[PDB]
Ligand binder design. Sequence first.
Ligand code: ARG
Ligand code: ARG
Ligand code: ARG
Ligand code: ARG
Lengths: 450, 449, 449, 448
Amino acid sequence: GPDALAARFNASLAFDRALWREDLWQNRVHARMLHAVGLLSAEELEAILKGLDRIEEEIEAGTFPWREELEDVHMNLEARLTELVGPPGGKLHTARSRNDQVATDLRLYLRGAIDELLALLLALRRVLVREAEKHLDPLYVLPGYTHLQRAQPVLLAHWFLAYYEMLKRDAGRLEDAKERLNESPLGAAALAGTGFPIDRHFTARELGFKAPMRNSLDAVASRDFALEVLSALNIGMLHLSRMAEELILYSTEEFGFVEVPDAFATGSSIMPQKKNPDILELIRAKAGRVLGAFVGLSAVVKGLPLAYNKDLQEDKEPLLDALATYRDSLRLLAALLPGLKWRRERMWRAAEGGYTLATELADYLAEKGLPFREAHHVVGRLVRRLVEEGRALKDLTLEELQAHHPLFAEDALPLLRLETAIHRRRSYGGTAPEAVRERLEEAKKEVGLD
Amino acid sequence: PDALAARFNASLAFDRALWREDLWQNRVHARMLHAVGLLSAEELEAILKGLDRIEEEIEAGTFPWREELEDVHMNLEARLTELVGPPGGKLHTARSRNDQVATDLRLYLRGAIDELLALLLALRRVLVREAEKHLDPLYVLPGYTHLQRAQPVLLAHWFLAYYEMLKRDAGRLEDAKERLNESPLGAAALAGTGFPIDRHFTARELGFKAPMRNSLDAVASRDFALEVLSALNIGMLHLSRMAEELILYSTEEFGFVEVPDAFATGSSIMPQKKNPDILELIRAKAGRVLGAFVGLSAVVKGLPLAYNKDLQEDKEPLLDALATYRDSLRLLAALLPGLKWRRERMWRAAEGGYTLATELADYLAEKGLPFREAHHVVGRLVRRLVEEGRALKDLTLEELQAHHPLFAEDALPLLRLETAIHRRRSYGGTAPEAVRERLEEAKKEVGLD
Amino acid sequence: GPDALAARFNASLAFDRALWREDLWQNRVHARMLHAVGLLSAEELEAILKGLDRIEEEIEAGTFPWREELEDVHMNLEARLTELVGPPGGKLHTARSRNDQVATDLRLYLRGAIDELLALLLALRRVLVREAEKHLDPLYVLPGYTHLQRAQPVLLAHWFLAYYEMLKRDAGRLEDAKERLNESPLGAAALAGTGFPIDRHFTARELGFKAPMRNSLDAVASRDFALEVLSALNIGMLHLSRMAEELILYSTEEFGFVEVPDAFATGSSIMPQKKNPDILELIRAKAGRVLGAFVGLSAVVKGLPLAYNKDLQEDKEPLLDALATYRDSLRLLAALLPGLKWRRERMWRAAEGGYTLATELADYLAEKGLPFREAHHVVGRLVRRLVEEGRALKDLTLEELQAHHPLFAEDALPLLRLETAIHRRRSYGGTAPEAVRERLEEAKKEVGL
Amino acid sequence: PDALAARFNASLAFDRALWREDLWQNRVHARMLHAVGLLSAEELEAILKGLDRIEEEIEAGTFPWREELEDVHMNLEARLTELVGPPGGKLHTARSRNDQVATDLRLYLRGAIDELLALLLALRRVLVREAEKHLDPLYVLPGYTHLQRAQPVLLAHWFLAYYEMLKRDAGRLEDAKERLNESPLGAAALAGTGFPIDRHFTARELGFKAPMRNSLDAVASRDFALEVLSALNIGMLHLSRMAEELILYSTEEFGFVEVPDAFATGSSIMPQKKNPDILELIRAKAGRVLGAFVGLSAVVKGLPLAYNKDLQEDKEPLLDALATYRDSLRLLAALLPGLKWRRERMWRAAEGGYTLATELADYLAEKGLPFREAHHVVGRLVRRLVEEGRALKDLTLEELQAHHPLFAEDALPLLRLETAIHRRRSYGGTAPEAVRERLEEAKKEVGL
Ligand SMILES: NC(=[NH2+])NCCC[C@H](N)C(=O)O
Ligand SMILES: NC(=[NH2+])NCCC[C@H](N)C(=O)O
Ligand SMILES: NC(=[NH2+])NCCC[C@H](N)C(=O)O
Ligand SMILES: NC(=[NH2+])NCCC[C@H](N)C(=O)O
């Protein structure tokens, strides 16, 4: 250190280079505007634009002189342009400040990041719907949980479609975030506009923005959009952490419901049936670094006076990490889910326990007028005796069920064996194979699979 | 032990808040039961009759809150049956506590989010009126960057910077509101039910857009809660930037604005020292809302599907965040109109001897000087003026015109605030000309004429 | 009502009431000092002192005039002393500011609360030790997990002692936290001492502080201790959240390793094989709110200029909530552990699976002289072949072993069975009963039982 | 999607930061294998010469870091076998990556906290130097409350508040250090070993106070990491408080101090503007450390016992927090000394015409008057002054005796900051003698 420590400490080039494309795009657009407005001569724009192509080629070919000494990506492209085309380069940044320049780059970068994220979610929602179908044919059933205690029986199909609704809501948050941040700060200069004959509506259009921001001060100081995106990303990983958790569980000897693909696991030589879900674990675990990011940036913008402040530079690092995290997580789950091997039978024996369907017998009485609570006790004694006699609920006979309580009839019988009892919960959103299938149709039409 | 485990599990303490919501879904629920046969016309009449007594009882503070029943749901039920007899025991038919509490929370956040949208609207309105006020006589203060005087800014412009910020906060509250307005009732414990229950009837009667299409999701998802807490945070965070700034602009050092007596405290002795207590609390409260978001996020991470007891740790944080934001939206809309901004002091601060020198540079730049160069030029002139102990205003045509052949008469107007503020008239800038259209425009979006 | 809201919003009495004691105990020591220094006559000292004793009575009677219009516990207790003893009352708060007072109170309140916490933690580690010793003989074994996958057989006694280590370190964090905040801020008065000939070493000494804080500014402005305590609480619940996770898990119909006492669970009317671990769920989930609290407060002090600010008020609520969470959690846990039922057989069967002990078989060959790698291929080939022959590791004959590898010999036979194999990892800190019994003894002398 | 997963799973990109500690641990483990009897002498004195080559290679940039191997552990190993041959593959005898990585992190932090302690002692050392420097001609600025001028305070006093603060920070780090200095090496995968492994030997040679007493705990615990982050967070929080104030005192509005050119930015156009870039970053970076703490906590919540891949999310946030506090601690020690405090603008603002009207209340009340009224009496006075457009430095003993008989002549020195600044002489007070006292206490605590 210490002048070096200072330099290093202040520099953002180590991470802001990730936005070089957004800075290039803005450059072309902004340079073209300076021309249209009279601030730049055709000869000049021509050079700047010619020079900007060489820069991009140099970057894509790993020959661009990235210099930390130049502090950020902004001055880096600028310095380079001026080395490539003499004087013209030194006019590209006319009527502009880093302030409005940074916020434009960041927003520009997120819109793309989000569009790529929305793409990644469609793919995931597709594998989901696809997996739901693949396990609806030979009907797959397993236990639904509560307090991690088995409750009523559920279909893998209904289960996959559970994450379908979840991931669908995520896509809508990233969407609404995207739309809302799609304003342009370019043209706000340092904090108050300029006297320069600038044209912000032009720069807004050409750059994909719905319109230019209406307040130069907020244009330069706002980062609430970064926060909105980080939250979307937070909630998303939380949904993914839920699924990793369950797949990690059902992947245990204790459950034995599913085998994770070798590609996303590690085993053991000296050991037979052992396989560790490292990738599912890291996805589950990575939800924290994304939460960590949201907390970090919120603390940053708290009580932060108005307009640009260097504190604001602390905004990029968290996002790039959060995005990469959520990006790569969505990609893996879509490459892993269809490679899953579900052990049907072990799931079925688990779903239809010894007396789990008794819940159904209770509802049956209730529907006929027997106070549902009153019915819960009569039905309880029934099973209680079955245990005493060491018999399952599948063995009950109609006569035997009739002695228990008059309300029972021939129709109650099909409710003793999972095979037919599942068709019961056919309300909108139930697990019943009819309700689930009906829903698998929408999902299909929705993600365009059919 | 014993009772500790009871009080520890009891969610009654705070879920009483959703009493109106619960009460409401009960009616809609019972009515649906009747519509599907599960309830006798005479039973519904009794049920509805008892639920009214309950409403009247709670309202009167005469209703019996029993912690032994652990939550709000069973409290209303125990009481209903205690009043109506057997019919009570039928209310909770074809329904689980899982889908019941869920419907309640999001049913309550819809109303809360409405009260909050109403508050923000109100708040935006006063920023706009406050903007119109300091626009004509014309208030101007320094724009800040790194907290150092940057460029003269119009106070009207300043209010509008927050107008757009709070405007975006409404968008998030709205969009979040619209997303949770799906009904989870009729989803049972996790799978659907066998009873001939109708979810569209309830969803619809209860105000929801439509029924949620997945029973598992419906009773396990609390993501809507996290989307609201996220907005509350960003919302409070916006309020802290304003509070911080008011706490700063009202110091003896700045001396830009004076806080209303109603929201501050002082000491008979020192006549100045006016402690901005309300604003500090507003600022420091951004912390709780952040914490609430972290708390809940942590609660739901890696939570196996369906209902889990953990999901109950969802109502306390919200209630607090909702309460913090609401109270803050109210206080500022009450406080801001009463601010006394010191025009002259603000005006002098803005024109700090050479702040307008940046205007001369753009001038050269626009005529033709590169800009990095134009900068060097006005700086060599600025240094000369500080040396000779002279302010930028005391420069003369020929002298300025001497420093660079590009300077002409039309540049003169740039040496004095009085006429320079009319400079940055680009879309979104502080030039009065400009702030005036963004001000008309705003007025229309909230109520002008 | 605006004026109404403003007051409510700022009112701290709702939660600082909790500190009535410390504020009281303080009012005493401070007065005795005001006298001993001459600012009060004995006829005044006695007056105030007796007025305080009455207050302690009115409070612990439900008769104290808790009045919100008074804003906080400090003036509420004061306004009353002037109502009970008259004129001498209005001198109790001489040479003291609400600043160094509220801080002195909190540091005092936490110290007491930490001791409680330390008793609770100490109590919990005893119960961990009781259960360890109990399940040592008869010898309880279960799977040692890794990636939540069966790894190597472990002892319930070792499991318990693991947590023992964890809770041992937590208390330690609480120790050093307390002994660090145990410096007195009383007498910093607002910031900067006073001309009053106060004796702060007196008030420091008589209020349990090892000493009075060396800098008034720091004394009034700091809350880093509140933050340090909160962190300890966080790590504490996190350790607990892990044990809670394993009991919720181990008590599932899938693992079947343990059964939770009904006092802390819930069941079903038409089922019996179901038992819900609500309390353990809630204990795990509430680790979130303590974390959110640390976050709340850290965000309040970030970039906070010096001396007192209204921002600090935000310190009490978070602390009270986290401290109560960890407290009841340490209590419920203690009462719940000794009463659960560990399934001997199910656990043992899961520990010694089909070939899980084969790893000990490879360590053998490696110790003998086979590159730890190589040996894996060999034993792996052995298991692979046993999987096909449809045989368990517990069937290999000395003959077959010597056939697979010449290095195998007699003393390898006991590695084939669990009953004789859990004696293998006898290294310091291992699971071999020889080793655990040694740490259990050590652990007993440590917690005095 | 093979490469994606590999990259997602790899920890090399960041865990390579702990190579020094990994190399040190290998040497000890080997030294112990040989002792214990699991390595011939030929073998040890081969693995060692190979661990020296690896060091030279790593420090020279010729060492082959391979992402494919995943972590630093396998990387070094792969090179050992490559460099020495068969002996290499026995270094990992009776050891897991689990007890190995836990150890390495503990090794790293220890050296880290020690580095941080030295930086704290260096910062506190300059704070004390600054206090002294500004006592000489004597600097006074207003103490604040609600960011409002409260009671005049000594700049030296101001510096000592932060000295007490960092002092406690050093304490949390110091206690966090030794609480985590117990070797987990030897716990193996999650339980000990049947191997005649020596755990106290490793611990000693590795600087540890002793071996962790429970294999399970040792391999599964990250509370030490959580503890260190917390200390970092709280410490950084102390720096942001100071940073904020320097940013604030250097505004054109307060004008108390100027930030050294080497840590600021400016413009020839506006020669009165000077941006505290480094200080604003030091303030802002309070957030990422906060978030680091949050993330690691979220990782360990509800996490089953033993090792879990989740525990790999421990190094990245810690490396980022450490570098943050580290650099922040350095910049300030370099920045503070170059500051230029404006004795007058400061002094001036302190004594604001009525400021000391508080000293007259503590007068009347000490003289026997009930404070609640004394403070009320002086109010009348100041009030009558604002109306007469008069100060408080102008007040005359008579006007005083006029207002309230308890006023004596010994009270005139309470109107001019020149003299009144000596009133607050209680322990820890802002009065010069009080401060001068503490300042000598501090000099000794470090270096006179
Ligand atoms: N003094 C200024 N206006 N600086 C603007 C720099 C912004 C910085 N490069 C960032 O990426 O956040
Ligand atoms: N075991 C249950 N189904 N409990 C339902 C109670 C839910 C609790 N009142 C909550 O708000 O989360
Ligand atoms: N203006 C003041 N000095 N107020 C002191 C009151 C502090 C308040 N009771 C708190 O706990 O933070
Ligand atoms: N399956 C295992 N034992 N893996 C150990 C790898 C630990 C990983 N290198 C980390 O730093 O967290």
